[PDB]
């Protein structure tokens, strides 16, 4: 199924995922497309941070959902 990921810079990424995909898998897919190491990524859906070790289905994320990608904060 297809989901969307929106960055704070305004970029929309499309991903092909399955309901059983873990959040780790989704971040790896974003690494594959965007070069962003998973440890720099955080994913937000419906106002909540998605936890590694859980699946998209666990969060009721269905086709054509938009997740928000926000990255590690630097400082300093």
């Amino acid at each position: 199924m297809q989901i969307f990921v929106k960055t704070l810079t305004g970029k929309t990424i499309t991903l092909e995922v399955e309901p059983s995909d873990t959040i780790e898998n989704v971040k790896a897919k974003i690494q594959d497309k965007e070069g962003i190491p998973p440890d720099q990524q955080r994913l937000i859906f419906a106002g909540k941070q998605l936890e590694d070790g859980r699946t998209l289905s666990d969060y009721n994320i269905q086709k054509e959902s938009t997740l928000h990608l926000v990255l590690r904060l630097r400082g300093x």
């Binding site: 959040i23 998973p38 440890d39 955080r42 909540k48 941070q49 936890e51 070790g53 590690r72």
Partner: peptide, 13 residues
């Protein structure tokens, strides 16, 4: 974060 990487934490982790 630990020696193997970083995980988003909250209600389950």
């Amino acid at each position: 974060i630990d020696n193997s990487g970083s995980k988003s934490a909250g209600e389950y982790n």
